[PDB]
Amino acid sequence: PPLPDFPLSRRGDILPAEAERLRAEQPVARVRTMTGDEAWLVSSYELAKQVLEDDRFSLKDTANPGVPRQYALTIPPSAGLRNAVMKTLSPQADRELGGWLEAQAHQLLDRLIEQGPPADLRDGFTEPYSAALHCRLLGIPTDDWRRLMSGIDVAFITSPRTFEGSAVNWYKDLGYMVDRLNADPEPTEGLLGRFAELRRSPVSDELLATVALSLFGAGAVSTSAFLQHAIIALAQQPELADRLRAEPAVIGRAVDELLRYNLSIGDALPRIALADVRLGEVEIRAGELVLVLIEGANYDPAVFPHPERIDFDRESNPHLAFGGGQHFCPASALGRTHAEIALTALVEKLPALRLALPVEQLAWRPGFIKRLPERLPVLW
Amino acid sequence: PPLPDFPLSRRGDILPAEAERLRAEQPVARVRTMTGDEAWLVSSYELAKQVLEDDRFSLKDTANPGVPRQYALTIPPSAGLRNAVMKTLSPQADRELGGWLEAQAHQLLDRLIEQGPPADLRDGFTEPYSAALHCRLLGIPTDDWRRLMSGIDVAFITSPRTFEGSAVNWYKDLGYMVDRLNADPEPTEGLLGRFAELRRSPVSDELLATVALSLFGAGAVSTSAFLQHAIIALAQQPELADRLRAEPAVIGRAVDELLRYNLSIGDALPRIALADVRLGEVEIRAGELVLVLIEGANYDPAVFPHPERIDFDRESNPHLAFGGGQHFCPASALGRTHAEIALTALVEKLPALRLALPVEQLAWRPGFIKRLPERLPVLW
Ligand code: HEM
Ligand code: HEM
Numbered sequence: 001p002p003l004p005d006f007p008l009s010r011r012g013d014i015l016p017a018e019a020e021r022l023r024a025e026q027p028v029a030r031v032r033t034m035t036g037d038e039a040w041l042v043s044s045y046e047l048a049k050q051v052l053e054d055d056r057f058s059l060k061d062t063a064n065p066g067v068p069r070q071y072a073l074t075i076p077p078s079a080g081l082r083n084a085v086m087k088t089l090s091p092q093a094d095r096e097l098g099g100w101l102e103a104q105a106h107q108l109l110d111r112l113i114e115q116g117p118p119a120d121l122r123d124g125f126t127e128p129y130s131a132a133l134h135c136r137l138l139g140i141p142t143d144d145w146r147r148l149m150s151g152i153d154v155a156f157i158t159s160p161r162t163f164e165g166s167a168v169n170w171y172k173d174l175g176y177m178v179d180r181l182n183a184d185p186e187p188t189e190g191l192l193g194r195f196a197e198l199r200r201s202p203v204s205d206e207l208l209a210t211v212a213l214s215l216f217g218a219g220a221v222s223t224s225a226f227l228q229h230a231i232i233a234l235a236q237q238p239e240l241a242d243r244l245r246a247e248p249a250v251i252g253r254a255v256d257e258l259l260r261y262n263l264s265i266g267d268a269l270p271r272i273a274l275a276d277v278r279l280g281e282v283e284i285r286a287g288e289l290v291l292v293l294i295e296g297a298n299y300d301p302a303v304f305p306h307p308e309r310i311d312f313d314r315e316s317n318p319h320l321a322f323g324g325g326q327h328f329c330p331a332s333a334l335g336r337t338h339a340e341i342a343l344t345a346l347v348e349k350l351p352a353l354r355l356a357l358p359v360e361q362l363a364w365r366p367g368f369i370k371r372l373p374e375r376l377p378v379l380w
Numbered sequence: 381p382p383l384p385d386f387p388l389s390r391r392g393d394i395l396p397a398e399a400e401r402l403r404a405e406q407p408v409a410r411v412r413t414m415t416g417d418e419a420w421l422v423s424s425y426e427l428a429k430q431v432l433e434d435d436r437f438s439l440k441d442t443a444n445p446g447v448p449r450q451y452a453l454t455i456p457p458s459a460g461l462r463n464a465v466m467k468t469l470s471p472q473a474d475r476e477l478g479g480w481l482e483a484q485a486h487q488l489l490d491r492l493i494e495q496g497p498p499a500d501l502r503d504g505f506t507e508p509y510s511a512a513l514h515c516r517l518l519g520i521p522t523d524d525w526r527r528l529m530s531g532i533d534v535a536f537i538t539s540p541r542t543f544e545g546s547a548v549n550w551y552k553d554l555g556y557m558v559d560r561l562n563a564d565p566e567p568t569e570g571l572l573g574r575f576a577e578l579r580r581s582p583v584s585d586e587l588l589a590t591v592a593l594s595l596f597g598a599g600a601v602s603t604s605a606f607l608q609h610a611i612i613a614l615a616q617q618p619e620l621a622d623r624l625r626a627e628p629a630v631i632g633r634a635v636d637e638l639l640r641y642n643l644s645i646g647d648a649l650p651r652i653a654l655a656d657v658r659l660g661e662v663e664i665r666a667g668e669l670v671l672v673l674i675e676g677a678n679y680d681p682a683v684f685p686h687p688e689r690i691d692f693d694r695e696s697n698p699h700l701a702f703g704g705g706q707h708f709c710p711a712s713a714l715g716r717t718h719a720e721i722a723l724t725a726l727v728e729k730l731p732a733l734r735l736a737l738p739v740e741q742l743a744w745r746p747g748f749i750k751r752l753p754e755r756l757p758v759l760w
Pocket of ligand 1: 218
């Protein structure tokens with residue numbers, strides 16, 4: 001027979017029809033990835049939760065030489081840092097984050113209002129707003145955000161084969177972090193401040209900058225893409241923005257539901273089976289690639305009635321947008337706060353927010369870890 | 381039978397196979413445009429030259445209500461201005477243009493060199509370099525170039541139906557031109573300077589700003605897109621950049637050949653037949669839409685041997701990249717100068733210039749008047 005191909009579709013404004021058929025017909029299915037390797041695509045909520053919470057399936061080992069891949073690695077080839085890192089990802093270790101984020105959002109939003117519609121809400125909000133957040137998370141200035149976000153454009157490319165340029169891109173920004181950490185007025189504030197300190201107590205510079213880089217990349221790309229999907233929802237269903245205006249306190253339940261809904265994840269969560277395991281009806285052999293399809297789990301009608309309709313008042317919403325098990329997103333609280341504040345500012349300041357053209361004419365980015373529109377032109 | 385669909389393909393790095401079949405099989409062919417109207421696609425050099433030089437085929441009338449369209453108009457609904465305009469499009473009416481352009485190019489190029497590869501040559505060069513040129517052409521500052529280029533992103537969308545937002549976008553930047561022309565230190569220098577003067581001699585503000593807007597839009601979009609295609613050629617055939625380095629004076633013949641080669645034109649030149657005309661073997665009835673396919677003419681082997689191989693030493697190269705007949709590009713000299721200077725700077729400063737990833741993985745913009753890569757990541 002012919003294997004279904006993976007990934008599924010770049011169009012991000014409706015669930016891929018193929019993700020619905022996979023969950024219904026073959027919740028665990030063999031698929032051919034874009035590298036040509038084969039893999040197991042897990043697309044039901046129960047089975048997807050099982051894999052994520054079972055450490056016999058390993059994320060660490062998906063980067064070993066020789067294993068099957070869904071796309072080439074872009075990164076080339078245990079020390080009490082957890083604290084430096086975990087302290088930075090507690091929105092409760094920076095009391096001022098909330099109000100500072102609100103001021104950044106309104107700053108960007110006010111700039112667009114003076115210029116008048118239309119505006120591209122990716123380059124005007126979401127991109128600078130996600131760079132600014134992560135520049136502050138590290139304690140480095142927002143001056144270079146365009147250059148840092150552009151580095152993300154390359155770092156998160158999904159390519160069938162390794163490509164020159166992902167290595168050059170890695171070492172180029174790695175040098176940038178090194179430079180900020182070793183600047184003369186040694187950095188205070190942020191992970192880079194906690195890092196300059198940690199290297200006086202009684203870990204290398206390369207490895208420090210590595211953690212700074214992957215945290216900036218992983219976060220700016222993920223918050224910006226989700227936030228563009230949230231915007232598309234509010235622009236298309238304006239009754240949702242009315243709800244937010246009338247009942248501002250629902251913003252927590254609403255971001256939670258948009259998280260379940262959103263299709264910003266353009267690949268699958270990868271795991272390498274460390275042992276033979278039985279999963280649903282399929283026998284998975286050690287060394288094989290397993291791919292968790294978050295959108296299949298989060299649209300599974302066994303767990304989420306009317307999964308295709310956004311609903312802020314679900315009795316229960318135990319979605320997998322942040323992963324699960326051991327590798328559950330460490331910054332989940334930070335990601336919620338970031339989106340809650342941005343959307344609250346958006347629906348106050350642009351109350352007639354809508355798309356400037358039919359949603360079907362948005363240009364969706366090919367070949368990227370996230371599904372995102374290249375531009376997000378809106379009116380208000 | 382089923383009509384071939386138009387436009388042809390967004391991928392811009394090789395000739396669309398369908399454009400070769402149309403020229404060989406049906407040089408004049410009925411096609412269904414993206415609006416659903418039908419039209420005559422003229423794809424041979426002789427026939428395409430005929431249409432362009434025959435004023436019974438009318439560009440003016442392609443904007444009349446009711447006529448067939450290849451895409452909706454984005455603009456909504458004879459006065460001695462020709463001089464103000466023609467004086468601005470003579471690279472010989474600004475002695476300083478050459479050296480100023482060279483300084484802008486090297487400025488942008490030096491900025492990329494200090495940051496190190498990879499760089500996106502669309503956002504780093506071509507876009508700011510084409511905005512700067514056209515900001516100077518009008519005598520307005522380069523401060524807002526990002527906002528002006530973003531307006532181009534919407535103004536030149538090809539949509540099956542009119543969309544809100546193209547009108548708002550038009551009036552929004554129309555106001556910008558009006559504001560620069562009616563600024564307190566009334567503008568000197570450029571079309572806006574020649575305009576503030578022309579309205580003291582013994583034409584309305586709306587109409588003045590209209591000419592400023594369409595000239596900025598038509599030029600920034602066309603020079604930026606061609607220049608990205610020229611870059612892709614030099615990066616892929618590095619023997620061409622060696623030729624330019626060794627024999628700098630060939631830059632005129634080389635831009636001329638890249639012009640013949642380039643696929644930045646994503647639509648066809650539209651004409652409304654004012655009369656019945658016989659064209660090749662086809663009888664065209666008055667009121668019908670005729671579409672000239674520049675890439676078919678410029679790859680026609682009847683006129684250009686080995687049309688698919690870039691060649692700087694063709695005996696003759698009478699291409700149609702700039703149109704022809706009455707509506708031949710008024711700024712053709714300006715467009716050549718602009719590209720010649722940019723490419724000369726590019727191959728001096730980035731001598732190992734190449735694409736950062738396989739050319740087949742470039743993201744090509746959908747639904748736009750130009751074929752262009754969304755990003756152009758390179759190494760050197
Ligand atoms: C709305 C925003 C975000 C969404 C939807 C999201 C989603 C996810 C998901 C699904 C995972 C699990 C991946 C797996 O199991 O393989 C993950 C992992 C991760 N999250 Fe992203 N994320 C967001 C924001 C952030 C932010 C703000 C940061 C950092 C600044 C961050 C840092 C990380 C890191 C480092 C991991 C890897 C954890 C590990 O290796 O165990 N996330 N997140
Ligand atoms: C490499 C750059 C350029 C290329 C390849 C190019 C190409 C063309 C073509 C093919 C036409 C004819 C369209 C038709 O017959 O319907 C045209 C028209 C036109 N060119 Fe663009 N162009 C370039 C640069 C520029 C620049 C720099 C400006 C202005 C700043 C400009 C202004 C115009 C205008 C106003 C028209 C319309 C003329 C009319 O209505 O008769 N061009 N050009």
